[PDB]
Design an enzyme around this catalytic site. Structure first.
Site, mmCIF file in Angstrom:
data_model
loop_
_atom_site.group_PDB
_atom_site.id
_atom_site.type_symbol
_atom_site.label_atom_id
_atom_site.label_comp_id
_atom_site.label_asym_id
_atom_site.label_seq_id
_atom_site.Cartn_x
_atom_site.Cartn_y
_atom_site.Cartn_z
ATOM 1 N N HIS D 40 0.816 -1.215 0.000
ATOM 2 C CA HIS D 40 0.000 0.000 0.000
ATOM 3 C C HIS D 40 0.850 1.266 0.000
ATOM 4 O O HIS D 40 0.307 2.354 -0.220
ATOM 5 C CB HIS D 40 -1.004 0.000 1.174
ATOM 6 C CG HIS D 40 -0.429 0.434 2.490
ATOM 7 N ND1 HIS D 40 -0.084 -0.463 3.477
ATOM 8 C CD2 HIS D 40 -0.171 1.671 2.993
ATOM 9 C CE1 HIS D 40 0.393 0.199 4.520
ATOM 10 N NE2 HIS D 40 0.351 1.494 4.251
ATOM 11 N N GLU D 52 19.406 6.406 8.043
ATOM 12 C CA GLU D 52 18.876 7.564 8.750
ATOM 13 C C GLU D 52 18.525 7.171 10.178
ATOM 14 O O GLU D 52 18.042 6.067 10.435
ATOM 15 C CB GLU D 52 17.633 8.130 8.049
ATOM 16 C CG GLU D 52 17.894 8.771 6.682
ATOM 17 C CD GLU D 52 17.705 10.291 6.672
ATOM 18 O OE1 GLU D 52 18.104 10.963 7.646
ATOM 19 O OE2 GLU D 52 17.156 10.816 5.676
ATOM 20 N N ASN D 54 18.017 10.375 12.820
ATOM 21 C CA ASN D 54 17.339 11.661 12.862
ATOM 22 C C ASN D 54 17.001 12.041 11.428
ATOM 23 O O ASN D 54 17.866 12.473 10.668
ATOM 24 C CB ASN D 54 18.228 12.700 13.532
ATOM 25 C CG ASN D 54 17.502 13.984 13.817
ATOM 26 O OD1 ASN D 54 16.807 14.524 12.960
ATOM 27 N ND2 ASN D 54 17.656 14.481 15.032
ATOM 28 N N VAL D 57 17.684 15.919 10.041
ATOM 29 C CA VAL D 57 19.031 16.504 10.277
ATOM 30 C C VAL D 57 20.050 15.775 9.402
ATOM 31 O O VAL D 57 20.039 14.542 9.397
ATOM 32 C CB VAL D 57 19.435 16.442 11.763
ATOM 33 C CG1 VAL D 57 20.934 16.287 11.957
ATOM 34 C CG2 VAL D 57 18.914 17.630 12.552
ATOM 35 N N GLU D 62 24.037 8.755 5.658
ATOM 36 C CA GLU D 62 22.805 8.437 4.958
ATOM 37 C C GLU D 62 23.036 8.367 3.453
ATOM 38 O O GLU D 62 23.820 9.139 2.892
ATOM 39 C CB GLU D 62 21.700 9.451 5.303
ATOM 40 C CG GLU D 62 21.887 10.875 4.772
ATOM 41 C CD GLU D 62 22.349 11.869 5.853
ATOM 42 O OE1 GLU D 62 23.540 11.831 6.237
ATOM 43 O OE2 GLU D 62 21.520 12.679 6.332
ATOM 44 N N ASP D 171 1.760 0.592 20.438
ATOM 45 C CA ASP D 171 1.234 0.239 19.128
ATOM 46 C C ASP D 171 2.068 0.928 18.063
ATOM 47 O O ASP D 171 2.751 1.919 18.331
ATOM 48 C CB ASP D 171 -0.240 0.655 19.008
ATOM 49 C CG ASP D 171 -1.020 -0.158 17.988
ATOM 50 O OD1 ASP D 171 -0.475 -1.135 17.422
ATOM 51 O OD2 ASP D 171 -2.207 0.201 17.764
ATOM 52 N N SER D 172 2.006 0.385 16.849
ATOM 53 C CA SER D 172 2.422 1.152 15.690
ATOM 54 C C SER D 172 1.334 2.170 15.351
ATOM 55 O O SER D 172 0.236 2.170 15.919
ATOM 56 C CB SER D 172 2.700 0.232 14.499
ATOM 57 O OG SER D 172 1.522 -0.438 14.086
ATOM 58 N N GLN D 174 0.098 5.513 12.230
ATOM 59 C CA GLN D 174 0.262 6.106 10.909
ATOM 60 C C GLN D 174 1.661 6.674 10.743
ATOM 61 O O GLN D 174 2.185 7.356 11.633
ATOM 62 C CB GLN D 174 -0.764 7.212 10.685
ATOM 63 C CG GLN D 174 -2.151 6.683 10.427
ATOM 64 C CD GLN D 174 -3.055 6.835 11.615
ATOM 65 O OE1 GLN D 174 -2.614 6.759 12.763
ATOM 66 N NE2 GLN D 174 -4.331 7.060 11.351
ATOM 67 N N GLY D 175 2.244 6.407 9.577
ATOM 68 C CA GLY D 175 3.623 6.721 9.285
ATOM 69 C C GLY D 175 4.594 5.597 9.555
ATOM 70 O O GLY D 175 5.735 5.659 9.089
#
Lengths: 223, 183, 182, 223
Positions: D40, D52, D54, D57, D62, D171-172, D174-175
Site C-alpha cells: 500500500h 537515517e 534523525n 538533520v 545516509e 502500538d504502531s 500512521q507513518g
C-alpha cells in the site's frame, strides 16, 4: 469566440448549449423540439440547455431538456470532416419566449461577402485559453470559395464554407463547435472546424446548412 | 542539425519537457492524444485521441536519439512517452510503439509498451519522427533509421476509428498536430 | 431519538458542519473520501477513497430528514454532500446518490448529482444511513425508508476497485469510517 | 510508534524509509540492492533513504538511492488489505556499514507470544498527532490468531498477524506503514494496518512475511 462582444440579453435566443454535466458544444433551436448541431458533437445522454445566463451556473429562466434522439448525418466522416451536421430531438418540447426561440432554416445558400452572426461560449483568446461565462457574438463575412480552399488546401468540400477575417483577430474557437452562423435571419452555418484561434489565413470553417435542408425536413418528418 | 519542432508559442521543443499533443484542427478535428484502452484488452494501453477540442489529453515527453541534444528537431528519430497523472493501471510502459499488423482491421496501430533508448533492431518499433504538416502544424511519421540494414515500414501516421474510439495508425493521410506546453 | 453519530473527539455530529470521512482502518485501509473523476467520464464526479491514511480527502456536510433536528443520528435517512474547496469543474451536484446498475462491473456505485431534501420516490437514491460498524467506527448503509411503497435496494456500502481507483458500492462487506472535524 | 522508546543510532540498521509527505513509509533492507515494504506504500518514482536515524538533520551516514523497480505482490489490490507486501530494487547497491545492513528473511514462521521489535518514524500519540525526529522502537508480543481475529472480525487473513496489547498503550501508528517487525533476528512482519493507535482492543496488524519467502526469492532472482 475571439475578438467578439458579449451578446445582447435576448439577441441570440436560438442558441443552445449541449451538456453532459458541463458545456461541450453549441447548437441551434430550429423548432420547439429540434436542435441543429455538428455531427462531431455527438455523444449519448445529451442534455440541452436553453435560455442560459451564466453557463457555469444553473439558474432560473433556463430550461434543461434531455435529448431523446441524436441523428448524426449518415455520411459524416471523421477523416474528411465532411457532412458535419447532427439533429437532436428534445424529449419534451421547449417553451418559447423572449429568451428561447427558433431560427429559420435557409431557402437558398448565402453568397460570399454576406455578413453573419456567429455565437458561442468558446475560447476568447488567440494565444492560450479563456472560457467566458456569458454568450459571445461575432459579426463576420462569408469568404470566397477560393480564399477558403487556399487557406485549407485539399480540405474544403462543397458542404463547407469559411467565414471571418484572413488578417486574424476575429474568429470562432474551441468550445464554439456546433454553434450557429445566422445570415439575414437564416441558419446558414454550423461551427465545424478551424486551425488555431483567430490566426492569419486560418479562418473558421462551417457546415453549409443550405445543402442539408432536405435531409433535415425529411429527418424531422420521420421522427 | 535539422530545424527544431516548435510549440504553439513558437519556442523550440525541449527533450524531457512535457507537452500536450493536440490536433491542429479543432472542432471536428478533435482534441489531444491520451492514454486509452480497448474494450477487450486492459494492457498494454493504446494511444487514443480525445473527441473534444476542450480536452488536451495526456502530456507526453520526447526523448532524443542523442541524449546530448536537448532540442527536439524535425525528421529525427525519437521516443514518445505519455506521462500520466493518474494511477498506473498496467505494468507495460506508456512509451509509444508500432504494433504488429492487425488482421481484423488492416491497420498497423500505434500502441504502447514501447522502449526508451537503445536504438537498435530490438527497439525499431519505438522510434518516431516529427515532420512539418503544411502550415497547420506537424505530423508523426514512422520510418526509423536506427538500423540501416533492417527492412521497415515507412509511413505517415493518421487517425482512424476503432472500437468506438479514435486511434492512430500508419496511413496515407497524416493527421496534423500541435504541441502545447503542459500547464 | 436514535443515538447520535460521534466524531473522533466524541462530539455529536451536527448537520451543516463539515467533516472528513476517513477510513477507520489506516495503512492498507487507506485514508479519506474525496470527489473524483472516471478517466472516461468527466461528470458527474464520483466518490473515491484516497490511498494515503494522511489524506483526509474532501469534507462532507450532512442534511437530516427533519431540518428541525441538527443532530446526526444513527440509522436515520440523511443526505450527504461533498463541500469542495477547489473549483467545481462540473455543473452536477456534489450530493451522494446510488447510481444506476453498472453492467460493466456488476456494482451499484456511490456517485454524485444527488438531491437534498424532499423525502419521496423522486429522491429515493439520495438517502443514506450511518450505522455503527463493530467497535471500529461507522459504516454507510443504503436502505431508505422515505417511500414505504417503493421497492428499494437495502445494503451496506463497501469499498471496491474501479478504473484504477477505490470507489464505494453496495455490497455484503461494509467498510468502516470515522468522522473528523473539518 | 506509540508508547515506544528512542532506538538510538545504528541499532536498527536495516530500517529504511521511502518517499515523503502523504506517501512516507518505512521499509527493510533485505540485501544490498533490495527493500521490502508494504504494497500500500507503492508510488511511481520511489526514493529510498538508508542509514537515517534523525530524519530531519543531515547526519552524514545516509544514502539517498532511487528505486529502479517496484514490484507489488500480484495478488494485492488497493481496495483490499490482503497480501500487503512490495519489493523495491535500488538503482545502485547500498554501501553496507554500521548504519546500513540487511535483515534476514525468516526460515519459519514465528509463534504467538514471541517478542518482536517494531520501528518507524510514525505518529507517537494515541490522541492527536506528533511525528518524531528520531527512529522509535517498540517491543511487543505477537498475539494469538483468536485475539487478532476477535479484534477485527472478518478481516484477518492467513497472511496477517496481530502484535501489541489488547490494553492499548503501545502500538504502531500512521507513518510506521511498511516498516519492519523483527523477531529473533528475522523479518517476520511489515507494518500493514490498524484502527486508531494504541487503543483498547485494536492492536496493530502486520503482513506475515514467512508466507512470502518463496515469492520474494523468485522475484529478486528474476529481476
Amino acid at each position: 469566440i475571439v475578438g467578439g462582444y458579449t451578446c445582447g440579453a435576448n439577441t441570440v435566443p436560438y442558441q443552445v448549449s449541449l451538456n453532459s454535466g458541463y458545456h461541450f458544444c453549441g447548437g441551434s433551436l430550429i423548432n420547439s423540439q429540434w436542435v441543429v448541431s455538428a455531427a462531431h458533437c455527438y455523444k449519448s445522454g445529451i442534455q440541452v440547455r436553453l435560455g442560459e445566463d451564466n453557463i457555469n451556473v444553473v439558474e432560473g429562466n433556463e430550461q434543461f431538456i434531455s435529448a431523446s434522439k441524436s441523428i448524426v448525418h449518415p455520411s459524416y466522416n471523421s477523416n474528411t470532416l465532411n457532412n458535419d451536421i447532427m439533429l437532436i430531438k428534445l424529449k419534451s418540447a421547449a417553451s418559447l419566449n423572449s429568451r428561447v426561440a427558433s431560427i429559420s432554416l435557409p431557402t437558398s445558400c448565402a453568397s460570399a461577402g454576406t455578413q453573419c452572426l456567429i455565437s458561442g461560449w468558446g475560447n476568447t483568446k488567440s494565444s492560450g485559453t479563456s472560457y467566458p461565462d456569458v454568450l459571445k457574438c461575432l459579426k463576420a463575412p462569408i469568404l470566397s470559395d477560393s480564399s477558403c480552399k487556399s487557406a485549407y488546401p485539399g480540405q474544403i468540400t462543397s458542404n463547407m464554407f469559411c467565414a471571418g477575417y484572413l488578417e486574424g483577430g476575429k474568429d470562432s474557437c474551441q468550445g464554439d463547435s456546433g454553434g450557429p452562423v445566422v445570415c439575414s435571419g437564416k441558419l446558414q452555418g454550423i461551427v465545424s472546424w478551424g486551425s488555431g484561434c483567430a490566426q492569419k489565413n486560418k479562418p473558421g470553417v462551417y457546415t453549409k446548412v443550405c445543402n442539408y435542408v432536405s435531409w433535415i425536413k425529411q429527418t424531422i418528418a420521420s421522427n | 542539425k535539422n530545424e527544431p519542432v516548435l510549440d504553439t508559442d513558437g519556442d523550440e521543443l525541449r527533450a524531457g519537457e512535457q507537452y500536450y499533443v493536440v490536433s491542429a484542427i479543432w472542432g471536428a478535428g478533435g482534441g489531444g492524444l491520451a492514454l486509452g484502452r480497448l474494450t477487450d484488452q486492459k494492457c498494454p494501453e493504446i494511444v487514443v485521441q480525445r473527441r473534444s477540442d476542450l480536452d488536451y489529453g495526456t502530456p507526453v515527453v520526447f526523448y532524443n536519439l542523442d541524449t546530448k541534444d536537448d532540442i527536439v528537431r524535425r525528421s529525427t528519430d525519437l521516443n514518445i512517452q505519455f506521462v500520466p497523472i493518474r494511477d498506473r493501471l498496467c505494468l507495460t510502459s506508456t512509451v509509444w510503439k508500432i504494433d504488429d499488423y492487425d488482421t481484423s482491421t488492416g491497420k498497423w496501430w500505434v500502441t504502447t509498451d514501447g522502449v526508451i533508448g537503445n536504438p537498435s533492431p530490438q527497439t525499431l518499433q519505438s522510434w518516431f519522427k516529427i515532420e512539418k504538416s503544411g502550415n497547420l502544424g506537424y505530423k508523426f511519421n514512422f520510418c526509423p533509421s536506427v538500423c540501416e540494414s533492417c527492412v521497415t515500414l515507412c509511413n505517415d501516421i493518421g487517425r482512424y476509428g476503432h472500437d468506438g474510439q479514435i486511434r492512430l495508425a500508419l496511413g496515407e493521410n497524416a493527421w496534423p498536430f500541435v504541441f502545447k506546453k503542459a500547464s
